[PDB]
Write a protein that binds this ligand. Sequence first.
Ligand SMILES: CCCCC/C=C\C/C=C\C/C=C\C/C=C\CCCCOC(CO)CO
Length: 134
Amino acid sequence: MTRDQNGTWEMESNENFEGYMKALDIDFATRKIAVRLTQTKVIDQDGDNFKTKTTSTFRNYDVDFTVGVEFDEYTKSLDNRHVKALVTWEGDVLVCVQKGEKENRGWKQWIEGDKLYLELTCGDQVCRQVFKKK
Ligand SMILES: CCCCC/C=C\C/C=C\C/C=C\C/C=C\CCCCOC(CO)CO
């Protein structure tokens, strides 16, 4: 019964963000700035309907979805790719597959304790982020 991810979440760790960005072909100059940043994530969730806003001083990225409903996603101001995205529940873990030109691209997001965990995958690279609730 930990599917409720509502809140404002502040990043406390960001492991292998460098490798994940390189797997997405982010250029070096962009990576050099992006790797330093503390991200904030605001999740507005009504059951299976999610509105998410991820913010930083350098980039912001918003995505809304309903669990179980495939949608077109354009990762504007990140890697700027078009994918078909589907978010599902595996237990109380939110799982996203982003089908497109990059193999094995997706993410998983879940609550444990008072922390939000987010694992981002692209190819053979996994980035592990942890956020603390504000
Ligand atoms: C926006 C703040 C970015 C700062 C770095 C700026 C530029 C790096 C370019 C590309 C990095 C690719 C991706 C960025 C990582 C996570 C974004 C959010 C993706 C996961 O969020 C999901 C909902 O959306 C689940 O919560």
